[PDB]
Amino acid sequence: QQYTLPPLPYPYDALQPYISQQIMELHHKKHHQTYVNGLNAALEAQKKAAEATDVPKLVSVQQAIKFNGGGHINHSLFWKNLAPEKSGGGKIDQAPVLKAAIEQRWGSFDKFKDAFNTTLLGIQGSGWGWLVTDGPKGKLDITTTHDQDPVTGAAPVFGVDMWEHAYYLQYLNDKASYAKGIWNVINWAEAENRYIAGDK
């Protein structure tokens, strides 16, 4: 099946004033769309190389699958772990199980957020900040992935895109304000489901 761009589960302006409509449109229709197109071409290229038994080609195309495939995976998860304040955005208590696990690990929900913010701001270059679990209702950990590498060896609970294109038009260089503002639109209900499922 040819991969396609998953529609957003809300209007492009539903996350304002935390994430502008302009960013949402470009981020989804341009960047994410590009990763989808790139993934399709890459797999097609890998397919031909495999059929031709061209090892050099198969290995070279590997980076493309990883970059575009990881981009597709990451953004698909990103769109879903966000929501407007009217649809549960920022409603941490709509995730009782995950919230209880978070407080046990970091002491409190707010302490967890400061640690997460710190991690996002510590990412050098393009990357993502993630809250992950080692299984259904498992132990929680904060991790980061570079460029468009996806979370592996664990199940993603929620992610925050730290590529500059995810916030520059609005927050400019002030990524600290983007990080602190995105908390208002985190779809915790979706995070609750991912944590309980603990599906890597």
| Binding annotation | 27, 75, 161, 165
Q: Using an 8 Å Cβ cutoff, are 157 and 98 in contact?
A: yes
Q: Which of 73, 166 has the CB closer to Mn ion?
A: 166
Give whichever of 69 and 129 is closer to its own copies, judged by the CB atom.
69
- Pairing type for strands 127-133 and 140-146 reads antiparallel
Which two structure tokens, joined as six digits, stand for 13? 């302006």
Rule CB under 8 A: say whether 163 interacts with its own copies. yes
> Which residues between 121 and 140 bind its own copies (CB under 8 A)?
124-127, 139
Binding status of residue 100 toward its own copies by CB under 8 A: no
The answer to whether residue 4 forms part of the interface with its own copies (CB under 8 A) is no
**Smaller CB distance to its own copies: residue 111 or 200?**
200
Distance of alpha carbon 29 from alpha carbon 134, whole angstroms: 32
13, 24 contact by CB (below 8 A): yes
Helices (H) and strands (E) in the chain, counts: 8, 3
Does residue 163 interact with Mn ion by CB under 5 A?
yes
- φ/ψ bin of 142: left (φ > 0), alpha (ψ from -120 to 50), beta (otherwise): beta
Task: Look at phi and psi of residue 185 and say left if phi exceeds 0, alpha if psi is from -120 to 50, else beta.
Answer: alpha
Q: Examine residue 147 and tell whether it contacts its own copies (CB under 8 A).
A: yes
Residue closer to its own copies by CB (options 27, 99) is 27
The answer to the question of residue 40 lying near its own copies (CB under 8 A) is no
Residues that bind its own copies (CB under 8 A): 1, 3, 26, 30-31, 34, 39, 43, 46-47, 50, 53, 55-60, 62-63, 65-67, 69-70, 72-73, 124-127, 139, 146-148, 150, 152, 163-165, 168-169, 172-173, 200
